[PDB]
Amino acid sequence: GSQLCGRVFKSGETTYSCRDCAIDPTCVLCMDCFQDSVHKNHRYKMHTSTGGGFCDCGDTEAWKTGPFCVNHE
């Protein structure tokens, strides 16, 4: 029983992309999902939302590995 996070970022919020696993340049995670995921042990990059955009945790098509954090698995 797996879940999509779906979090929509607030302006100024830090987001996290995994350069090892991202399928496309937009794939990103919210902090909560990132720190509960394999990708905090990978080559990751920080970004700032200007308001909106959304976490891709749970999207099996957005990630080469580790599409779910341990809360959404």
Binding annotation for Zn(2+): 5, 18, 21, 30, 33, 39, 42, 55, 57, 69, 72
Task: Count interface residues toward K ion (CB under 5 A).
Answer: 2
Choose one: 8-16, 29-37, 46-54; the region binding Zn ion (CB under 5 A): 29-37
- Using the rule CB under 5 A, is 20 a contact of Zn ion? yes
Task: Find out whether 21 and 65 touch, Cβ atoms under 8 Å.
Answer: yes
**Does 57 contact Zn ion by CB under 5 A?**
yes
Best CA proximity match to 62, nearest among 4, 21, 2: 21
User: DSSP H helical segments within 23-63, as ranges?
Assistant: 31-35
Out of 9, 37, 56, 58, the only residue in the binding site for K ion (CB under 5 A) is 56
According to CB under 5 A, which one of 13, 54, 66, 73 is a site residue for K ion?
Answer: 54
Hey, how many other C-beta atoms are within 10 angstroms of the C-beta on 41?
A: 10
Largest CA distance in the chain: 32
